[PDB]
Amino acid sequence: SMSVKKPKRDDSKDLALCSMILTEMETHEDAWPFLLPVNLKLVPGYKKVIKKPMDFSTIREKLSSGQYPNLETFALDVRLVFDNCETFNEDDSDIGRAGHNMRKYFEKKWTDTFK
């Protein structure tokens, strides 16, 4: 509260570390469904159903231009990628499985790096 602060958790490396994690996700063999925004002109249903589209290129641009205020808003957009994927894709499809694999991969890097 006013003039009463918890000790300062060092956040000065967060940008570098989120960038490293994102590189690792970009270079995963199962990243291909997530590298670019879904083409809303060419994929029936996507625009109406998926209220907040998100992809790794869009997260990379946001990260590079100071549009994440903290590491939690970064994790929210990564999870949005996989939450959208589960919304639109069957679990037993190549893309559905890719999204599960990537989410697992992310969450381990996240825990190991920050928790």
- DSSP labels, 60-106: HHHHHTT--SSHHHHHHHHHHHHHHHHHHS-TTSHHHHHHHHHHHHH
Experimental technique of record: X-ray
User: Resolution of this entry in Å?
Assistant: 1.8
DSSP3 helix / strand / coil % (the chain, rounded to 5): 60, 0, 40
For the chain, give the residues followed by a break (C–N over 2.5 Å).
none
Q: Which domain holds residue 27?
A: 1-115
Domain count, the chain: 1
Give dist(CA 72, CA 103) in Å, integer.
Answer: 16
Q: Residue 63 maps to which CATH number?
A: 1.20.920.10
Name the amino acid, one letter, at 31: A
* Structure tokens that stand for 93 in this block: 């499809």
Q: What does the buried/exposed string (b/e) look like for 86-99 if buried means 16 or more CB atoms within 10 Å of the residue's CB?
A: eebbeeeeeebebb
Residue 115 tokens read as 């928790």
Q: What contacts 31, CB < 8 A, 6 or more positions away?
A: 25, 56, 98, 102
**Angle CA(16)–CA(51)–CA(35) in degrees, nearest 5?**
40
Rounded to 5 degrees, φ, ψ at 7 are -60, 145
| Cβ atoms 36, 58 nearer than 8 A | no
